[model samples]
Target: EDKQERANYEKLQQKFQMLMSKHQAHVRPQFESLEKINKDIVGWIKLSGTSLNYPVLQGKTNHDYLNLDFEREHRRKGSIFMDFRNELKNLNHNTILYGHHVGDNTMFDVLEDYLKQSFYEKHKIIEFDNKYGKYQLQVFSAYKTTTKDNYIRTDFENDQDYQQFLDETKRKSVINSDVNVTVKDRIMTLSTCEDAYSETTKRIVVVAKIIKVS
Candidate 1:
């Protein structure tokens, strides 16, 4: 029975991936339908070589979608959500997105693969499209840390502050990369719960700089 359940879950995930890939080719039309279903659908995010493709949402508060699925149904896995403080149209210096780490190869669970440098080299680009336009995320850093870290900050007082943030994040990366970030570039952060250090609060964070816009 347990094996059957696991097989069924994997089948469902495969089907969802097919559907998402089809929709991704015509993302604007997909967005039209998605917006009609839920106005909170601000954008779509796709990370190739992984199952991290889904529509991103933002609620009145960060906690609104923490336990709700895209259809507003109660789901423990929840939905990929943008930080409530972020403006989708005008992205902040560091736009933060959150997802649950259920360890079922779903949501942001694939973020854990970044710990391997081989994975980082192959899948360095992330596709993020908002109502305003499309953008590319160049993965520069992946690290494990606690929530006490200030990585979620979106606002920086000046160039020195922003440059410091860029340097710090790059230095923390476990994988060595030549991806350069500057104060002029916008960046995004993908955060998920990390269970490796289960004693206290911990998170696996993947930081990427917006290298292209179209």
Candidate 2:
């Protein structure tokens, strides 16, 4: 009985080591790649989002994630993340961009940190980086509009459209953000799910009016 137990323990240890090795092999590069990605993104565009230092992402398989993942063999790396002016416009064609509500501080979790009442002040600042420059956004709107009305109108083209967007935004926000913008302005809004305790989950958003990139 003792001899058999020892054998089993040895086998389990070997299996555990293999699994650990695989996990490290898989996750380390993924994290490194994401870090590099952020660096490139900062370098390539005027960017905005959370102030919490961004991490090289640690991704797990078989789990839904918030940030869009680069596909294998670098097949779509050039096409997917860290895009520029014309490319950025086509991807969403709007000022606001929405991603997932992943739990593990990935995706919009760090960005979402700002929406909290306590973090509200710190959340007002924005950061951006471009291939040739880096810029900051004047964060104006970090509030929640509903599934019906959107402050982020993708197609409106004039001052009137801008007014409608502004009106709806003020009406729906959970808190007040004092930043100002207009139809002529190019804004970047990052949004994610905010599962409030009672109300239907709100979309937590971070809005930034690009400041300057250099």
Candidate 3:
């Protein structure tokens, strides 16, 4: 009976992924639909060699997207969304995004793969675009931390604060990239649950720097 239950769970997981893929395909190309529904939909972010391609949303507060889907439906796999504390029009020192690490490999399941140096080498750049312009972020810092860690700072009192932040974040990375981060450049962090850790408090984060904007 235990084996049968495991098989049933796997089947359900497969079904959920299929549905999510179909849903994403339907929504991604429909710019008119997204704009009309959620004008807060600011941009799309993608990580090469992974399923991290998804639309970014910002609401009145940070918790808006935690229980909502792209279509604003309540879902277990919440939308890949931006921190409401940061502005899409005028970005902050550090922009943060959060997503669920679904068992079916949707959302941010691939983000944790960056812990391997090989994965980091193959996919070092990320592309993100908003209505104002398109931007590319180069991976500089990637690591596993937890919710308690202060990895999601949006604003800094001064350049010195940002400089210290840049130095410490790169230090936490397990794999180093050729990319460099500076106080002048904007930063992006992708946050997701890392269930492999015995402690549920643990989280995996991939940090990057804005290398290009056009």
Candidate 4:
């Protein structure tokens, strides 16, 4: 009976993955029209080989979209959004994004799966395109940490200052890739809660550096 139960669970999981694959493939079309309602729609972020393809929004204030959807609807699974401090009009030195860790593996919750080195090996790039152009972010760091303030910085005094921050971030990674990061590269940091008990989960941070721009 246990074997049969395990097989049934696997079959159900496969079906869910198939449905999510379909969802990821067809989400970009609506993003343009959706922007008509909410001008905050900046661009879309696609996590290759996963269901993390979604429209990224940026409002005047970061708190505005914390509990709001792409359509500006009130939803628990708010849109994957950018920090207000960062300029979505163009890439920042350390562009940070925020999303809730929803239970059904939606939003940024699925990002926690990077704790496994196999997962990072399979998926190493994040495609984030803005109105200016398209770009590829090569994943280098994925780690969990408690409340912190400086990881979201967008402006830097100099390359050396930013590089120091980069070194520290790489060291904290639970799964580290040998991906080269230099001072010239722009960055993207996706952050979400790693735990939910009492709503104070350590932040799961995924850092990537811009490799190609077109």
lDDT of 4: 0.74
Q: What's the lDDT for all of these models?
A: 0.79, 0.44, 0.73, 0.74
Tens-place lDDT per residue, model 1, 90-147, is: 7789899998887878888888999899999999899988666778999999999875
Q: Considering every candidate listed, which one attains the maximal lDDT?
A: 1
Report lDDT (Cα) of residue 49, candidate 1.
Answer: 62
TM-scores of the models, in the order given: 0.84, 0.53, 0.79, 0.80
Provide the clashing-pair count of each candidate structure.
0, 10, 0, 0
Q: List the residue pairs that clash in candidate 3.
A: none
Q: What TM-score does candidate 3 reach? A: 0.79
Over 1-214, each residue of candidate 3 has an lDDT whose tens digit, in order, gives 4364334434533543454365543434434344665677777677655667777878887678876766576766667788778876588888998888856666788788889999889988888766656678888878888664588799889999889988988888999788866888999898884332335787889999875455
RMSD, candidate 4, Å = 7.2
- Candidate 1 — which pairs collide? none
Which residue runs does candidate 2 get wrong by more than 4 Å? 1-68, 71-94, 145-152, 193-202
| lDDT (10s digit) by residue, model 2, range 24-98 | 434333333334533322221112343232221113321212223322222111111221222331223244433
| Candidate 1, superposed: residue stretches over 4 Å from native | 1-29, 194-200
Given candidate 4, what's the lDDT at residue 37? 53
Largest TM-score belongs to which candidate?
1
Residue 137 lDDT in model 1? Answer: 90
Q: What is the C-alpha RMSD, rounded to one decimal, of candidate 2? A: 12.5
